[PDB]
Swiss-Prot record:
Compartments where located: Cell outer membrane
Originating species: Escherichia coli (strain K12)
CDD domains reported for this sequence: Slt35-like
GO molecular function: calcium ion binding; lytic endotransglycosylase activity; peptidoglycan lytic transglycosylase activity; sodium ion binding
Biological process (GO), any one: cell wall organization
Main localization (coarse): membrane
Protein name as it appears in the record: Membrane-bound lytic murein transglycosylase B
Record membrane topology: Lipid-anchor
Cellular component aspect of the GO annotation: cell outer membrane; outer membrane-bounded periplasmic space
Keyword line: Cell outer membrane, Cell wall biogenesis/degradation, Lipoprotein, Lyase, Membrane, Palmitate, Signal
Lineage top rank: taxon: Bacteria
InterPro entries named among the record's database cross-references: Lysozyme-like_dom_sf, Lytic_transglycosylase_MltB, MltB-like, SLT_2
Quaternary structure and partners: Monomer.
General function of this protein: Murein-degrading enzyme. Catalyzes the cleavage of the glycosidic bonds between N-acetylmuramic acid and N-acetylglucosamine residues in peptidoglycan. May play a role in recycling of muropeptides during cell elongation and/or cell division.
Amino acid sequence: MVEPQHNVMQMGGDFANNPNAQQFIDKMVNKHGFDRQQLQEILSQAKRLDSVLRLMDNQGPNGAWLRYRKKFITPDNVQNGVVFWNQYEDALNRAWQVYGVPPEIIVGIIGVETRWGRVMGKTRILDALATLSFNYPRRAEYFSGELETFLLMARDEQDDPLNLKGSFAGAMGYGQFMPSSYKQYAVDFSGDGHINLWDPVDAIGSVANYFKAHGWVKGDQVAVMANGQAPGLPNGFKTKYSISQLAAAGLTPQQPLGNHQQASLLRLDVGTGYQYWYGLPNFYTITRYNHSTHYAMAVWQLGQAVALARVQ
Ligand code: NA
């Protein structure tokens, strides 16, 4: 009947003689009450993926922005964005009301991440996380934290850890949430008592909560395009200048900046030249999902494009 298998102390598979996998097992048992044998059975099936390791290692004017932008803002994506928006309008409206994050931002994030559920990843989360936790010294501590949370998440939401698929870094569902984001920011937005990253309604509320938690200011401007050029100043979403320094550099805002007294200097390569922008706090909040000016600008403009296509 009951088979404790106390004498089955060595697991097979890609992580068979891996000291890190052994230490991780002891941690799950000691800290979370996992059964060593049940966990060895799970991890003996986990795969060490070279592709996951290669990809994690891999990470003018010539029109850079234009090329990045066209990967996301196309008739097909805008049209699919409209369908997703109309289909989940209640959830989007409810997220706006509860979290102060507008539909265009959420629709934009889900569009850029997975094309609204069409591309959510094909790699088993367990394989990706185990590979990065046990065979990647550089980010081993970060990924072991993610694997720990993933196994707890699977245990709680009652999932077989081996059945969940996602990105090469272990990101999941519509919004490509990492296990740590699920833990800290995911919410039951459908109201069924569970948090399913693959349920569009839960994903919508979870992205909204993530944004509010990262400082999204309701109704505030994201960024304002500037007239003029500022070649003497370093640019990027991490920069910060007073509106006075930017004016002194030859820039003027196309729209009033209200009470904002500082901003980041963003520069987009539009082929014929450079297009400068005053990055406001909400722009930086978007970069909290993916540390990239292009990413954040594409997320925002995709949402705007969809918002416009709905009007027609
Ligand atoms: Na739910």
